Design a binder for this molecule. Structure first.
Ligand SMILES: *C(=O)[C@@H](NC(=O)/C(=N\O)c1nsc(N)n1)[C@@H]1NC(C(=O)O)=C(CC2=CCN([C@@H]3CCNC3)C2=O)CS1
Length: 622
C-alpha cells in the first residue's frame, strides 16, 4: 500500500488496457530501454511482436486478477498476476504472468520480455495458427437418397491457347460446343472475359475437364424451391456473423438456408507456441473441426421428381402426404430454376432469364396461400353434418345456373355449371354445386360455421421450416355480410389456404375426423388434434367422394380408368385456376393436393394426376 508500489500496479494495468484497445504502440511506450537487465527489445521490435501475434490471433478481452507488485530494489519491483483472454479460437483461462518493473526518476516502466505475450514463450519463440474448414452436411430423403450433397464434380472447361488461329478457332469452338451440347457464342463471351489469360483453365459446364469440389442437387429444379441453393460468402455476411470463413458457401433459400447452422459445421483450429523454426512447443488451444450434420426428410425423391415433371412446366404445385402420420412425400412447385447453375455458376443470360419469367419460378407455391375453391365443400358439409344443419337426404330443388337469397343482393349471384334440379348432399359434391352449398351454409350461419372452422388450424403456424403466412377465413374477424358468408361456403370469398395447409385440414377424412399435422423432418413425432369433425360426418362424406370419380357425371370420372381406389373432390376458379384433392379411402396410405395456376385451354389438375397417383397408390398402403 505504497505510492511507488501502486504506481507499478497502475503501470501494469495501463499496459494490459493498451493491449485490449489494440494500441500496441501505446503499450510499447511503457518498455524499458533494451538492456541486459531491463527490456529485451526496442519499442519498435516490441510493437511488431504484438501486431504479429496478438493481432493474427485477435487477442482481446484481457482480464487480470490477483495483481501483485513487490519491491526488490530501489529501482526494481517484481509483479505477478493471473489472466484470461479471448482469441479467435476460444478463451485462454488461468494464464500466469510474471515480470519486473524499472523505477528510475519517478518513472515506472516495464522490462519487456517475450513471456508477456504468452507465459511459456522464450527468446526467439514464435506462434502458429492453423484453421481447417468443415464439410457441409447432406439433406436426405426418407430413404437416404441425397437431395443436397457436397462432392467432386466433373467440371468442363477450355484453354484459349489449345484452340485455333482464325478458322481453326471459330470452327474448333464448334466441335466442343457439340460433343457437350452448349451454345457456340457463349464460348466466345467466356474466352474474352476480363480475367481470362490465354493459359488459364476456363470453366463451362457442371477442351479439358478437372475435378472440382462443389455443392450438388441431384433433383435439380424438381426440388429447387424446397431445398434451395447456396452462395459465395460475402463480406456483408461476415458482418452479420464474423464466425464465417471467406471460403465456404452459405444457404440462401429453402432448406439450405433454414438449416445452415446444422449443415455448415464448425471450423477447427489450433493455437500453438513454437521455437524459431515452427516446431510446436506448447499447444494453447485445439478445437478439432466438427463437420456438418446430415438431415433426413420425409420426402420421397421419386414422388418429388414425378410430381414436378407431371406439371409439364405450367404454373402450379403438388403436395403429397401419408395422412395418418403427416409425412410430406413431395413439395412440388412449377415453374422452377436450376439450383446447380445458381450454386456452381450460371451464365449472365440463363440468370437474367429466371428473373423476368412472369410466372415466377423462385416462388414456393406449395406455401403460397390461395382460395381453395370447390375442394373446400368437403369441409362445409362436414360442419353442417356435425351440427344437424344438413340432412344428407333433404332434397333441394334448384332451377337454372344463377341464384340469390333475395333481391337485396343486387347483382351478386351464386353460379353453377350443371343444371341438376334435385340436389341432395351426394349429388352436390358429385357435380360441385356451388348453390346447394351456398344455401346449406346460410342455413347454418356464421356462428355455427365458425364453430366448425375454428376447430381447424386457421391462424396457426405449423412446426415446419418453411416461410408461409397462416391460413385465414376472412380479412377481418367477422364476415359482416351474407354474400361473403356464402362465397366462403363454396371455397372463395376471403379464404386463403396454401397447399400444405389444405393437405392438413383434409387429413380429417383419412383419420375418422382427427386432424394430423404435417411432418417434414424424418424423425420428429407425429402431432394431431383429435375430434375436429365427427366420425359419422366422415363416413357420410367419403362414400360421396368416391362417387365424384365413379359416377359417369362425376367431376373426376376420368380417373376411374386407372382402376385404383380413389376418393376425391375437384375445383376451378376464375385466367382460370384448377384444383384436385385425392386420397385412398381403402387404406388411407396417401393423400395428394394438386393445383394448376392459370390453366391452359382444356388442361386440368385432374388430367395430370394419374402418373403420381399410380406410384403413391402402390408404394403407400398399410
Ligand atoms: C368449385 O370450385 C366450382 N367451380 C366454379 O364454380 C368456378 N368456376 O368454374 C368458380 N367459383 S368461383 C369463381 N371465381 N369461379 C365447381 N367446380 C368445378 C370443378 O371442380 O371442375 C367446376 C368445373 C366443372 C364442374 C363440372 N364441369 C364439367 C366440365 C364440362 N361441363 C361440366 C366443369 O368443368 C365449376 S363448378
Amino acid at each position: 500500500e505504497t505510492q511507488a508500489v501502486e504506481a507499478g500496479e497502475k503501470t501494469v494495468e495501463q499496459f494490459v488496457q493498451a493491449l485490449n484497445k489494440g494500441d500496441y504502440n501505446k503499450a510499447a511506450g511503457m518498455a524499458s530501454k533494451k538492456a541486459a537487465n531491463k527490456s529485451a527489445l526496442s519499442e519498435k521490435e516490441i510493437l511488431e511482436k504484438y501486431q504479429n501475434i496478438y493481432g493474427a490471433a485477435d487477442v482481446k478481452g484481457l482480464e487480470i486478477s490477483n495483481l501483485k507488485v513487490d519491491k526488490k530494489d530501489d529501482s526494481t519491483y517484481s509483479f505477478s498476476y493471473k489472466a484470461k483472454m479471448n482469441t479467435s479460437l476460444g478463451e485462454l483461462k488461468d494464464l500466469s504472468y510474471k515480470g519486473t518493473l524499472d523505477r528510475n526518476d519517478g518513472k515506472t516502466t516495464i522490462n519487456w520480455q517475450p513471456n508477456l505475450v504468452f507465459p511459456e514463450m522464450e527468446g526467439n519463440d514464435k506462434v502458429s495458427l492453423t484453421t481447417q474448414e468443415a464439410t457441409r452436411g447432406n439433406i436426405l430423403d426418407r430413404n437416404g437418397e441425397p437431395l443436397a450433397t457436397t462432392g467432386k464434380l466433373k467440371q468442363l472447361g477450355v484453354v484459349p491457347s489449345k484452340l485455333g488461329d482464325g478458322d481453326e478457332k471459330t470452327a474448333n469452338i464448334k466441335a466442343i460446343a457439340s460433343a457437350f451440347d452448349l451454345t457456340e457464342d457463349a464460348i466466345n463471351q467466356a474466352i474474352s472475359q476480363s480475367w481470362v489469360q490465354p493459359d488459364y483453365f476456363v470453366p463451362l459446364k457442371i477442351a479439358t475437364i478437372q475435378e472440382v469440389d462443389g455443392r450438388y442437387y441431384p433433383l435439380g429444379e424438381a426440388a429447387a424451391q424446397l431445398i434451395g441453393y447456396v452462395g459465395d460468402i460475402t463480406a456483408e455476411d461476415i458482418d452479420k456473423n464474423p464466425e464465417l470463413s471467406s471460403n465456404g458457401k452459405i444457404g440462401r433459400s429453402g432448406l439450405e438456408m433454414a438449416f445452415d447452422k446444422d449443415l455448415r459445421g464448425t471450423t477447427g483450429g489450433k493455437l500453438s507456441i513454437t521455437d524459431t523454426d515452427g516446431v510446436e512447443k506448447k499447444v494453447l488451444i485445439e478445437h478439432e473441426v466438427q463437420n456438418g450434420k446430415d438431415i433426413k426428410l420425409t420426402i420421397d425423391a421419386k414422388a418429388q421428381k414425378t410430381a414436378f415433371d407431371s406439371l409439364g412446366g405450367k404454373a402450379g404445385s403438388t403436395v403429397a402426404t401419408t395422412p395418418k402420420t403427416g409425412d410430406l412425400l413431395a413439395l412440388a412447385s412449377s415453374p422452377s430454376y436450376d439450383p446447380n447453375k445458381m450454386t456452381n455458376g450460371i451464365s449472365q443470360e440463363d440468370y437474367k432469364a429466371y428473373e423476368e419469367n412472369p410466372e415466377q419460378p423462385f416462388i414456393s407455391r406449395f406455401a403460397t396461400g390461395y382460395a381453395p375453391g370447390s375442394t373446400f365443400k368437403m369441409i362445409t358439409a362436414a360442419i353442417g353434418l356435425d351440427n344437424g344443419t344438413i340432412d344428407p337426404n333433404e332434397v333441394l330443388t334448384i332451377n337454372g345456373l344463377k341464384w340469390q337469397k333475395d333481391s337485396s343482393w343486387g347483382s351478386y349471384q351464386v353460379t353453377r355449371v350443371s343444371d341438376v334440379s334435385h340436389v341432395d348432399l351426394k349429388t352436390a359434391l358429385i357435380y360441385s354445386d356451388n348453390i346447394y352449398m351456398a344455401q346449406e351454409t346460410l342455413k347454418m350461419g356464421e356462428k355455427n360455421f365458425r364453430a366448425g372452422l375454428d376447430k381447424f388450424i386457421f391462424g396457426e403456424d405449423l412446426d415446419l421450416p418453411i416461410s408461409m403466412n397462416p391460413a385465414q377465413i376472412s380479412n377481418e374477424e367477422s364476415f359482416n355480410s351474407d354474400i361473403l358468408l356464402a362465397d366462403t361456403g363454396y371455397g372463395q370469398g376471403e379464404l386463403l389456404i396454401n397447399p400444405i395447409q389444405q393437405a392438413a385440414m383434409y387429413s380429417v377424412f383419412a383419420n375418422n375426423g382427427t386432424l394430423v399435422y404435417p411432418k417434414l423432418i424424418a424423425d420428429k413425432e407425429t402431432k394431431d388434434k383429435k375430434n375436429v369433425i365427427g366420425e359419422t360426418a366422415v363416413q357420410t362424406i367419403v362414400p360421396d367422394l368416391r362417387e365424384v370419380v365413379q359416377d359417369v357425371n362425376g367431376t373426376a370420372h376420368s380417373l376411374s380408368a386407372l382402376g385404383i381406389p380413389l376418393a376425391a373432390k375437384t375445383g376451378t376458379a376464375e385466367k382460370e385456376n384448377s384444383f384436385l384433392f385425392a386420397f385412398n379411402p381403402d387404406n388411407q396410405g396417401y393423400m395428394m393436393v394438386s393445383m394448376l395456376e392459370n390453366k391452359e385451354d382444356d388442361d386440368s389438375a385432374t388430367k395430370r394426376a394419374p402418373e403420381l397417383l399410380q406410384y403413391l397408390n402402390q408404394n403407400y398402403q398399410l
